[PDB]
Design a protein around this ligand. Structure first.
Ligand SMILES: *[C@@H]1O[C@H](CO)[C@@H](O[C@@H]2O[C@H](CO)[C@@H](O[C@@H]3O[C@H](CO)[C@@H](O)[C@H](O[C@H]4O[C@H](CO)[C@@H](O)[C@H](O)[C@@H]4O)[C@@H]3O)[C@H](O)[C@H]2NC(C)=O)[C@H](O)[C@H]1NC(C)=O
Ligand SMILES: *[C@@H]1O[C@H](CO)[C@@H](O[C@@H]2O[C@H](CO)[C@@H](O[C@@H]3O[C@H](CO)[C@@H](O)[C@H](O[C@H]4O[C@H](CO)[C@@H](O)[C@H](O)[C@@H]4O)[C@@H]3O)[C@H](O)[C@H]2NC(C)=O)[C@H](O)[C@H]1NC(C)=O
Ligand SMILES: *[C@@H]1O[C@H](CO)[C@@H](O[C@@H]2O[C@H](CO)[C@@H](O[C@@H]3O[C@H](CO)[C@@H](O)[C@H](O[C@H]4O[C@H](CO)[C@@H](O)[C@H](O)[C@@H]4O)[C@@H]3O)[C@H](O)[C@H]2NC(C)=O)[C@H](O)[C@H]1NC(C)=O
Ligand SMILES: *[C@@H]1O[C@H](CO)[C@@H](O[C@@H]2O[C@H](CO)[C@@H](O[C@@H]3O[C@H](CO[C@H]4O[C@H](CO)[C@@H](O)[C@H](O)[C@@H]4O)[C@@H](O)[C@H](O)[C@@H]3O)[C@H](O)[C@H]2NC(C)=O)[C@H](O)[C@H]1NC(C)=O
Lengths: 393, 390
């Protein structure tokens, strides 16, 4: 061989996740350059080569791993709920792609629902579109509809009263008896198929008119929130509480690892609506534990929220290529981004090596040490990898 | 023997009553000379008579007579009072007395539809309004097939009212989706019981192939509080087909290690729910419920807090110390959780948060009555001690 040979590099790396209906099917693609041109092989989670399954899984020699449309009775967890990867190899070495979370979704009929929202006069209301759990991963709230033929969409507040939150709930401030004169139903959309649907049931506000004074009460299921949202996405933090007189809402952010907290700063990006905090754009800096203190003249209450700002994982190794003499040490530094990072690991020609350090070190180079070196970074949801070639001389 | 004031009878942390009933809180202290009883507000100022709403009597009782809804005054009817005993040797203040007069008015509970997959267990909830939630609890459940489930034993090995007041139903089938469900709730200030206006119904879902256990985001983390010696239950809300298994564990405090929960006479497991007969202090901790079927798995974790009454005692009850020498007071307490432990001297804040109060070098001024206050967000307790000079 000699030189001029280059280790494989992914021209097009498969996606981290491909969700698709059984009625659509899917295809994931892998392309790798290099000299000589490398061989593309699809492998399962356990490292073995994937076999063709007639009608369900077919290897197309274009590099594509195809999952044809199929009927519900032909659903195979081995095929359709699996993590795949692309192995690329030539005489110089071999690399493995990031995890490819393949998830086929059998289409199912479903009905969203809306229940009666009980609220004290003057307090803000939050109407939830109840989506069945077995479609919650694909069904989102597009808009809300009223029997008065009124429609509300995500964007800006209507008449300074009605606001569709980013999280899909319909926020209504200063509720009075007259607001209970209409019923609310949500319009949901399946992101795979693309169809829209009105909830099978309507929801109305049940206004109470308390006499005397009542303290801020939060439902036990609302005292602790756990929210997830990715970069550059709009989101909202609920602080649902009821009282009379109407309560005030103050947000804080804990210092990591301590009980000490600091007041949340309001601005162009971070605005507050009653007790709901609205952020136009999420930065990883936003992550942490929040506190929402609610107050009226009789008592107080609070809501804790753990916010996690996920970010796409990326990685590259320094240097991309290095030639070191025999006996001399070889160094690989893995640089990565995204959030969170739970595990770092290394690979060499498809074989797990080293440990969880960001800097891989070879003390004394041998001829067997040459080839491709990879660095994988991972969290619960996705992964990313980077390659680097080591030559001798 | 001349001694400072000590509380003989102390009002309870919480005193709820209807505007039709009224209330009469009492405070009694011992000492020689006889200490005078004085009702005060948080800022230390004495509470004054409000005609027909708040009247102090010679017996030391603070009376709240029955009143009209239009006569409700927040400053009087939703206030934290305190009893102050005092004589020449010094004064002591009682634990916080949170008075709350409640205007009786109509409320109504509701029961929504529960969507459940065939074969799985269902839990029907009696939705109680917020403005009465502190006074209204589930008494029983009712069906349109003339069935009345009460808190106690399981019915036909299928229906069971949980200590939370929810109706638990194991292995639901289309047969269970024919009947309706109503809850009876009692208001503990009026003694009235009421049927819910709405009737809950089970919508059984037929399984479209296999499905992995899914848990709703609001069910992924549970935070339950329960009083010591009282009954309670821990939910594990997961839906899957075929029906999943449930395994409970308790984490070793502050570790990732966990060990299976021992089921026994006291701790029973009904499907996914963990029923406990009576709570013990050791139950407090972080639990984990693991759910599994052929398709996949899921997990729910619960933080359980066994609340217990706060009590305090100062060691020693009395001490005589010479000038120049130190005086030490040790606040020893029980109950859970303890959020703070502060001190007072003669009804005045002193020192900071610490179980031990130290006077480095006693002077004439340092003589008097010393107190320490333990309290959490729910309740408070106090203890007193006296410092004499030598
Ligand atoms: C809105 O309502 C909230 C209640 O949810 C209220 O915040 C609460 O304030 C109180 C008092 O500031 C906090 O309780 C304190 O917490 C600190 C830190 O733990 C303690 O050190 C304090 O100890 C005091 O108590 C001793 C007597 O037991 C005193 O002698 C001593 O000097 C201290 O004063 C005290 O326990 C409470 O923790 C917060 N609540 C939360 C959730 O943080 C807020 O002030 C209200 N705001 C408005 C505008 O209404
Ligand atoms: C403690 O406070 C309570 C709460 O206010 C108080 O009981 C209520 O007093 C009112 C007096 O204003 C009672 O009478 C009401 O008066 C109107 C006429 O002014 C009646 O028409 C009312 O009847 C209504 O209620 C029916 C359902 O219950 C409706 O279907 C009907 O259409 C009427 O609108 C009502 O009788 C009122 O009944 C009581 N309510 C309760 C729950 O007790 C009480 O007197 C105070 N305690 C004292 C002063 O010791
Ligand atoms: C019954 O169900 C429980 C609950 O799910 C199940 O316990 C779980 O097992 C899974 C593995 O099947 C554990 O998840 C892994 O944990 C390791 C650390 O121990 C992680 O490193 C793993 O991360 C990988 O997976 C991700 C995709 O989810 C990838 O994106 C990532 O890059 C890694 O490759 C993985 O998260 C889980 O921790 C436990 N949980 C508990 C509470 O035990 C149990 O195995 C089931 N029982 C049976 C008999 O099947
Ligand atoms: C992906 O999986 C999806 C879910 O299984 C598939 O969609 C489903 O497709 C079936 C058809 O295979 C639809 O069935 C409906 O059945 C009713 C009643 O069937 C009647 O017809 C026969 C003969 O006509 C009659 O003898 C019987 O007694 C019944 O009376 C029909 O009226 C409907 O038109 C429809 O055919 C499901 O409704 C449908 N579910 C969905 C879309 O959610 C999908 O086909 C799969 N994709 C692929 C590519 O196979």
């Amino acid at each position: 061989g000699g030189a001029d040979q280059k280790g494989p590099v992914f021209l097009k790396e498969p996606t981290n996740r491909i969700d698709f209906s059984n009625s659509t099917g899917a295809e994931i693609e892998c392309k790798a350059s290099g000299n000589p041109m490398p061989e593309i092989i699809w492998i399962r989670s356990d490292g073995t080569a994937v076999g063709d399954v007639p009608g369900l899984r077919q290897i197309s020699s274009d590099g594509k791993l195809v999952f044809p449309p199929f009927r519900a009775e032909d659903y195979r967890q081995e095929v359709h709920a699996q993590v795949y990867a692309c192995l690329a190899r030539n005489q110089f070495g071999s690399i493995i792609s990031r995890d490819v979370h393949v998830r086929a979704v059998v289409a199912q009929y479903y009905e969203a629902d809306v229940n009666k929202e009980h609220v004290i006069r003057g307090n803000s209301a939050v109407i939830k579109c109840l989506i069945p759990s077995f479609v919650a991963d694909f069904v989102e709230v597009v808009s809300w509809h009223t029997d008065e033929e009124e429609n509300y969409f995500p964007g800006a507040e209507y008449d300074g009263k009605y606001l569709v939150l980013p999280s899909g709930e319909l926020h209504i401030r200063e509720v009075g008896p007259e607001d209970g004169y209409k019923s609310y139903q949500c319009r949901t959309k399946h992101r795979l198929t693309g169809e829209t649907r009105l909830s099978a049931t309507k929801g109305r506000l049940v206004i109470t008119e308390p006499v005397g004074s009542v303290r801020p009460k939060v439902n036990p299921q609302d005292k602790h929130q756990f929210i997830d949202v990715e970069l550059a996405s709009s989101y909202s933090l609920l602080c649902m509480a009821q009282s009379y007189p109407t309560p005030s809402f103050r947000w804080y952010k804990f210092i990591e690892g301590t009980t000490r907290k600091q007041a949340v700063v309001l601005n162009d990006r971070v605005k507050q609506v009653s007790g709901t905090l609205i952020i136009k754009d999420a930065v990883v800096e936003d992550s942490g534990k929040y506190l929402c203190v609610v107050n009226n003249s009789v008592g107080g209450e609070s809501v804790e929220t753990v916010l996690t700002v996920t970010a796409p994982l990326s990685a590259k190794i320094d240097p991309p290529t290095q030639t070191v003499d025999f006996g001399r040490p070889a160094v690989f530094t893995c640089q990565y981004t995204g959030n969170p990072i739970k595990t770092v690991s290394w690979m060499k020609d498809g074989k797990a090596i080293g440990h969880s350090e960001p800097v891989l070190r070879i003390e004394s180079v041998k001829k067997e040490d040459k080839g491709m070196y990879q660095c994988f970074v991972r969290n619960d949801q996705e992964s990313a990898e980077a390659s680097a070639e080591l030559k001798l001389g």
